[PDB]
């Protein structure tokens, strides 16, 4: 069952690294096996103190277990942060590494599980709540308050694993966080209203 | 090649635009459709993703060329010089009438 | 209700030194309204936690939003790559 599961991931990782060549980058052994929240602090300690991903599968470094893809999620997250700290925030290779990591992390999260409030005291008393929880990433935008115009900006395409301080081209610029809206969809009008007889 | 100046910015569409179905005389950019700077009057459903590059050999009549002619007939109802360029300009006035009939 | 408003403003002082990640003119475009973040453009109208059937307080944290995004399996992608060449 897991034999083809070792091959179908390898085929996607080979096909999705043509324009950027993430797999063909130089990568050392890097035996950390640590918390992936602390995956960059141990790398900075390795820099202060002192075999590529295409060759790991050729050498048989991954086994058909949970650790055999925990190490893959560790190694891809090691490669992507090295490429983020190598390329600047304006190059197209940065966006290619960001899109490749956002695809690879979703591909590694999938196919693994298959194998104080005054409203609350009324709503919990009157209804029954079935819950569903998930996590989303957010971004940052700029903010300029001129003479009664209230200027806004666009979505910064900076990756979530950049770990750089927030530089400002001007002191008077402000920063803000955009909360994403996600719920059940609104009932859109039909095709009689969309494309009506004018 | 027509210059499709996008809404709400001074940018130019490279190869893709978003044709509107209720204003019918504007387009959008790819980043402008991602970030939603099209105004609060619309609900982001009446925006058809169309192309801007050159098509294949003539008398093929793909879905974009079939949609834009029926859009322009509902706009003007005459003046086929103003109908042939709504497809993209690469179709003849004498040929769009033969296709519509 | 007006349609032909500007909704685009560019400051005359060019501070285009460290600005390459934003949306440039080719200057910085400054809108009158902010941006919106949409997670997934496709909605799975099944997955009965959303459709709420009338048969039978329960909490359940699902892994990732990709259940509601119609994500295919990797075996079909590998089969299509085998059909590519």
């Amino acid at each position: 069952k897991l034999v083809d599961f070792l091959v179908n991931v390898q085929s996607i990782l080979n096909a999705a690294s043509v324009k950027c060549h993430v797999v063909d980058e130089s990568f050392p052994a890097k035996f950390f096996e640590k918390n992936p929240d602390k995956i960059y602090e141990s790398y900075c300690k390795f820099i202060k103190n002192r075999t590529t991903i295409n060759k790991r599968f050729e050498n048989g470094e991954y086994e058909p277990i949970q650790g055999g893809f925990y190490k893959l999620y560790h190694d891809i997250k090691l490669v992507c942060t090295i490429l983020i700290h190598f390329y600047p925030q304006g190059t197209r290779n940065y966006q290619l590494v960001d899109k490749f990591y956002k695809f690879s992390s979703e591909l590694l999260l999938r196919e693994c599980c298959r194998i104080a409030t005054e409203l609350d005291k009324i709503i919990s008393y009157d209804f029954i709540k079935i819950s569903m929880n998930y996590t989303v990433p957010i971004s940052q935008t700029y903010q300029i308050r001129t003479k009664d115009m209230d200027l806004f900006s666009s979505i910064i395409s900076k990756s979530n694993l950049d770990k750089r301080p927030h530089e400002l081209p001007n002191t008077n610029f402000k920063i803000n966080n955009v909360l994403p809206q996600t719920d059940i969809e609104n009932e859109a009008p039909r095709l009689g209203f969309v494309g009506a007889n004018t | 090649h027509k210059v499709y100046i996008c809404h709400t910015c001074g940018n130019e569409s490279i190869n893709v635009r978003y044709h509107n179905l209720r204003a019918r005389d504007t387009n959008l950019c790819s980043r402008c459709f991602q970030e939603g700077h099209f105004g609060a009057n619309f609900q982001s459903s009446d925006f058809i993703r169309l192309e801007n590059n050159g098509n294949s050999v003539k008398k093929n009549w793909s879905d974009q060329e079939m949609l834009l002619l029926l859009e322009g007939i509902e706009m003007y109802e005459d003046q086929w010089e103003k109908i042939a360029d709504h497809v993209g300009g690469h179709k003849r006035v004498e040929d769009c009438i033969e296709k519509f009939l | 209700i007006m349609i032909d408003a500007a909704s685009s403003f560019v400051l005359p002082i060019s501070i285009t030194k460290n600005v390459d990640v934003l949306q440039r003119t080719d200057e910085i475009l400054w809108f009158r309204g902010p941006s919106v973040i949409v997670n997934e453009r496709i909605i799975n109208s099944g997955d009965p936690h959303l459709s709420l059937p009338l048969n039978r307080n329960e909490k359940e944290s699902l892994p990732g939003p990709f259940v509601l995004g119609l994500r295919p399996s990797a075996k079909f992608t590998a089969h299509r790559l085998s059909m590519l060449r």
Binding site: T146 | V3, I5, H7 | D4
Partner: peptide, 29 residues
Amino acid sequence: FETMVANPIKVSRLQSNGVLTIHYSLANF
């Protein structure tokens, strides 16, 4: 900084819909 109003960029819908991109056609000498 609050006295720094900007220049509006108009839509120009007639220049947005179907503008193209005459001595190149030899009919006017």
